[PDB]
């Protein structure tokens, strides 16, 4: 399944996508991306669009 993270950061604004078997797998990948970029925000998940949002 095609999952996406929308990054609403103070400095970094954008999106990343990954193919994953489930949302738990995708989530762990997107949290590492946020960690790698120092993005520290609140996480929400929208399963209608398989999209995570992290909002700083």
Curated annotation (Swiss-Prot):
Membrane-spanning ranges: none
Source organism, top-level taxon: Bacteria
Localization: Secreted, Cell wall
Protein name: Immunoglobulin G-binding protein G
Lineage per the UniProt record: Bacteria, Bacillati, Bacillota, Bacilli, Lactobacillales
Shown residues in whole-protein numbering: 444 to 497 of 593
């Amino acid at each position: 399944m095609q999952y996406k993270v929308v990054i609403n950061g103070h400095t970094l604004k954008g999106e990343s996508t990954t193919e994953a078997v489930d949302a738990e797998t995708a989530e762990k990948a997107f949290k590492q991306i946020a960690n790698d970029n120092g993005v520290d925000g609140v996480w929400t998940y929208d399963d209608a669009t398989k999209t995570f949002t992290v909002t700083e």
